[PDB]
Structures are given as structure tokens and as C-alpha cells.
Amino acid sequence: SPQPLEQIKLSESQLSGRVGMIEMDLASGRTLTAWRADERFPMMSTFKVVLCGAVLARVDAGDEQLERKIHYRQQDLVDYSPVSEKHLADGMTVGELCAAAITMSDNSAANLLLATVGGPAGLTAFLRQIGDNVTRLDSWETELNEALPGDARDTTTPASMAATLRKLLTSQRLSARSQRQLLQWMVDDRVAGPLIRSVLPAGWFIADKTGAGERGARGIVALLGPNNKAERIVVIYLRDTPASMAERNQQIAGIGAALIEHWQR
Numbered sequence: 411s412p413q414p415l416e417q418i419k420l421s422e423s424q425l426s427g428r429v430g431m432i433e434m435d436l437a438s439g440r441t442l443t444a445w446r447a448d449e450r451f452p453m454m455s456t457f458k459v460v461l462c463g464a465v466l467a468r469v470d471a472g473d474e475q476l477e478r479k480i481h482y483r484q485q486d487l488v489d490y491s492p493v494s495e496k497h498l499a500d501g502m503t504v505g506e507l508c509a510a511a512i513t514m515s516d517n518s519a520a521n522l523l524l525a526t527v528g529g530p531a532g533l534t535a536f537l538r539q540i541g542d543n544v545t546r547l548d549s550w551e552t553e554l555n556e557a558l559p560g561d562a563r564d565t566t567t568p569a570s571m572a573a574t575l576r577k578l579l580t581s582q583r584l585s586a587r588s589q590r591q592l593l594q595w596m597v598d599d600r601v602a603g604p605l606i607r608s609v610l611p612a613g614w615f616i617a618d619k620t621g622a623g624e625r626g627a628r629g630i631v632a633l634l635g636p637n638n639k640a641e642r643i644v645v646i647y648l649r650d651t652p653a654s655m656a657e658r659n660q661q662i663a664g665i666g667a668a669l670i671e672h673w674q675r
């Protein structure tokens with residue numbers, strides 16, 4: 411593979427799209443590779459990790475319980491609800507809703523959770539409160555995936571998202587149990603995790619959440635590292651490309667491959 415920045419540039423040229431990327435040491439927050447790290451990209455389903463961080467903050471405060479059941483109606487469901495549509499009769503616990511949102515990308519689960527934190531405005535307030543002054547959620551599922559050209563709504567930047575993920579996972583803002591839960595949900599991703607594992611060299615840790623949206627929007631937030639260790643946060647977003655989903659996937663994979671082949675800093 412080319413060197414990481416070389417590969418990232420090639421991905422833009424080939425997709426005729428914008429790529430944004432950061433690679434960050436998990437333990438220290440040291441920024442390692444960066445590209446358009448201060449530019450705005452749709453979060454899409456990657457927002458669900460931040461959402462469940464806010465939910466866990468409420469649990470830690472005793473204002474929420476992972477075991478609390480939420481009940482809802484078929485008329486509440488939005489597009490793509492593989493787990494939540496199965497529980498119209500019995501409801502789902504808050505913990506199961508976060509598991510469905512993160513591990514299956516369930517959109518109605520995410521909306522039910524989003525309401526518990528005060529909606530898009532509440533989640534944005536939580537972000538400001540942890541010192542992310544950039545990331546913003548404005549819409550619910552599935553409008554938050556619209557990726558309107560030039561729109562600031564429902565965006566993050568690679569740098570802000572990486573810093574925020576690090577805060578949630580390691581800063582002790584969340585309790586020990588909550589930090590561990592948020593990572594385990596990402597470890598358990600069923601959408602992309604198994605596929606990624608199947609193609610990663612032996613010895614590499616992976617945890618992830620992916621997203622997809624309109625106008626080619628695509629992304630991944632991940633923890634990655636050799637020696638079976640979660641060493642670095644890698645955030646990669648794509649926007650404004652007409653390319654097939656297959657090609658967007660392949661380009662993100664190519665950027666990942668370049669980072670892995672050229673890991674030593």
C-alpha cells in the first residue's frame with residue numbers, strides 16, 4: 411500500500427469525494443495521521459456511540475438504568491429497525507436499545523434513546539458539556555443521514571469525534587463500568603465487525619461503529635491495534651461522492667490497510 415496520506419489522497423481522487431481522517435493514540439490523545447481533521451462530515455450511525463455515552467452518563471448519575479424498560483408502538487418505528495420491530499409487545503430495556511443501536515445500527519432504538527437525553531438538542535448540550543464545541547446533532551433518525559451538501563447540521567469533524575470518543579472511553583467522565591460497556595458495544599458490532607476481522611491480519615484488535623448516508627456519505631469510528639491491544643482511535647469519513655457502496659467500502663479498507671502496513675510512528 412501507499413503511505414497513509416498518499417492513500418487518502420488517492421481515495422479522494424478516485425472517488426471524486428472528500429475524505430476526513432484522524433489516527434489518535436487512545437491513551438494520550440496524541441494525533442498521529444490527520445487529513446481534513448477540522449472539516450465537517452455527517453456522523454450518520456457513528457453518532458450512536460456518542461448517544462450511548464450520554465445514556466451511560468445518565469446511568470452513572472442514577473437518572474437512568476440500563477434495566478429500565480421502554481415501551482413503544484409500531485407507529486413510532488422509522489426505517490431500519492431489525493431488533494426494535496421485534497419487541498412491540500414487550501418493549502426493550504435501555505441497555506438492549508443501546509446494544510441494538512450500536513451493534514445492529516437499529517434506527518428506532520437510537521430514536522428512543524435520543525429522546526431520553528433530550529433529543530438532538532440534549533445530545534448537543536451533552537457534547538458541549540464534555541468540551542466538544544464542534545460536533546452537533548440536529549435531526550432524528552433517519553433525517554440525520556441526509557448529508558445535504560455544505561450542511562453543518564448533524565456533523566462532526568474527525569478531530570472532534572476522535573477527542574470525544576477518547577473522553578467517553580478513557581477520561582473517567584464515565585464510570586469504570588460504563589467505559590467498559592461502551593467499548594464492549596463497539597466490540598460487538600454485527601454490521602461490520604465480523605467482516606473487518608475476517609480481513610485484518612492476525613493479532614489486531616478491532617472495535618467499531620460504521621455509518622452510511624446520502625450523496626455517498628460513509629464512515630467508521632474504530633479502535634485498532636497490534637499485539638491484541640486497542641492502541642489507537644481511527645476515524646474515517648467520506649462525503650459527496652457518487653461511487654457505489656462497494657467502492658466506498660474498498661477505499662476505507664485501503665486507507666485502513668495503509669495505516670496497518672505503515673503503523674510504526
Ligand SMILES: OC[C@H]1O[C@H](O[C@H]2[C@H](O)[C@@H](O)[C@H](OCCCCCCC3CCCCC3)O[C@@H]2CO)[C@H](O)[C@@H](O)[C@@H]1O
Binds near residue numbers: 663667
Ligand atoms: O485506493 C483503493 C485501494 O484499494 C486496495 O486496497 C485494498 C488493500 O490493498 C487490502 O490490503 C485490503 O484488504 C484488507 C482490508 C483491510 C481492512 C482494514 C480495516 C480498517 C478499516 C478502517 C478502520 C480500522 C480498520 O482491502 C483493500 C480494498 O480492497 C489497494 O490497496 C489499491 O488497489 C488501492 O490503493
